[PDB]
């Protein structure tokens, strides 16, 4: 028992992280087979970032303008291509530690593990969720660009995020591994800001089920509610709408605990209306929304 | 920026985890050089656990009574020894992926990363702190015994924890890697329970500094306090005493932010006395005490 925000073991990803330098900019790259993936803004100067034309900037680079370092061994770049906001650097050596992998784009509300790296060297691993406004609340310092987010399934690493930038609110924005941004963000200097966010309701319910599985039951009640009547109170507190699909996904957790989904919804409605009253749930004094139903079943 | 509960990259430890079976019990072992370390209760039946004499139980075992599996490759056990509450199984093959490592015992209040494994297979990684009452609030299911806790320094893995048992409150107890329990717990079935816990004050102050470094300043005030006057209010709320050593350790964080330690203490005193008033600090609605001063400097 116990419930922790838990990341996937990172070893399979650590063996893919390399250092990529272009000019005076150094950041992280992902080395899979004979390709290294990194943010395309590695080719940019601070002056370019104001209004870059990446097609123009890249046609002016040579293979030798990219220094790739895998620990000690330097990787010879034998070609380069742009794919949306990611650069693909073909190197003359296939990474001998390439795991079985896939590039998967995730949905707002789903979680992934982030391996934060600097100069190609992994520093830490932590779990995040893709927010409804397509930002992530990560922990990233200067030099973290190119760090990746991933899930693991059996032996297969599903890469879903590459880090590109920090927004003015301190939240983070990036792309999938095909180079396509999450959300309406761009890799240039603009006034862009995160939109208004909402709470991931299905995740809050999953986490309340985790609490029950762990013997935390004080927030339960005998009342129930309809899906409609719940969603009227959800909207009022900036919660995402709950759908029948979400109810169905919560089925297994409902079965294991014997608490119907709309019964749990009645508990959540009271928690929203009365607050927590100096009590905690699974060690937190607020309603946690960065655990998916899968995360709960996996840990419990 | 951003602040997350962040574990060390686990790859170096994943390569050391193996499966150890004795009789009908299966759990995890740590494979370093030609030795596999695991909880000695692996040799126990449920009847033995009531009042085991481990010296007697082990003299009755042979090398062939221990099945060690490193992924597929089975490890031939060529000798065994007991070291306190850990069993040491000499195997005929030295782990080719043995990292540079040390066995270090930690203090209450310090943190470490836990690699939770099952059947020798890593499942997740998360950060924990050693509580003042020598328990940890982990996330462990049946079969997690033998999972290890560690810190990483440069290239050196400092192992500090092996998981042995769950206490009735759902918290966890284990040993250092020399087999010596943290706290007054034993590896047999008794009425043992965690003692009363306290909050790690120096860590709360470190985390308030993390908040300031990240632009969260609402809890600050212009008031100050003496160490003595702080510690009178600390005791009242079940906080550990703050010492001049703790003030000195917080020096760098005080310098980076320009906020004196006893100034931060005045803010903490007001937070304890008035509560948080529906506001959050670094995304939490309670005072977080599982980040050391080192953890803050490392992430910030």
Residue numbers in the entry:
A (entry chain A), B (entry chain A): 1 to 300
Q: What's written in the study?
A:
To elaborate on the impact of the G15S, K90R, and P132H mutations on the structure of Mpro, the apo-form structures of G15S, K90R, and P132H were determined at 1.77, 1.66, and 1.82 Å resolution, respectively. There is only one protomer in an asymmetric unit in each crystal structure, and all 1–301 residues could be traced in the electron density map. The mutant residues 15 and 90 are located in domain I and residue 132 is located in domain II. All these mutations are far away from the catalytic pocket; thus, it is reasonable to speculate that the G15S, K90R, and P132H mutations do not directly affect the architecture of the catalytic pocket. G15S, K90R, and P132H showed merely a slight difference from WT, with average root-mean-square deviation (RMSD) values of only 0.54 Å, 0.52 Å, and 0.58 Å, respectively, indicating that all these three mutations had a limited impact on the apo structure of Mpro. The mutation of the amino acid at position 90 from lysine to arginine results in the breaking of a hydrogen bond from lysine to the water molecule but does not significantly alter the conformations of surrounding residues. It is indicated that the G15S, K90R, P132H, and WT have similar enzymatic kinetic parameters and the impact of the three substitutions on Mpro could be neglected.
During the proteolytic process of pp1a and pp1ab, Mpro is indispensable and cleaves polyproteins at no less than 11 conserved sites. Domain I (residues 8–101) and domain II (residues 102–184) possess an antiparallel β-barrel structure and take on a chymotrypsin-like fold, harboring the catalytic pocket between them. Domain III (residues 201–303) is a globular domain composed of five antiparallel α-helixes unique to Mpro and is crucial for the dimerization of Mpro, which is a prerequisite for its catalytic activity.
